[PDB]
Ligand binder design. Sequence first.
Ligand SMILES: [Zn+2]
Ligand SMILES: [Zn+2]
Length: 99
Amino acid sequence: SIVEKFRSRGRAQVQEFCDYGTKEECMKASDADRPCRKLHFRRIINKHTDESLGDCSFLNTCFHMDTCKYVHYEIDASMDSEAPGSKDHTPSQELALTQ
Ligand SMILES: [Zn+2]
Ligand SMILES: [Zn+2]
């Protein structure tokens, strides 16, 4: 695990790539048991399910949440700049779920 020695000094010149620096090859290794630092985007995926089941379409709005069958592809990474005011966020100051 020498690549860890590079994450230990924190050299800025190392923030220009991961272990090797491949476009499609490292991607396959981004979320697999392949070398690399394993620290690349952690996204959850499921086997190709028949989309006739529900639909979700997370691409924008999930509509009904009760669905969320196996179709879903989301990435987890630090928080971005995040727009100010976040008006694109529905209100929910109440702790209890409205119903
Ligand atoms: Zn990598
Ligand atoms: Zn969903």
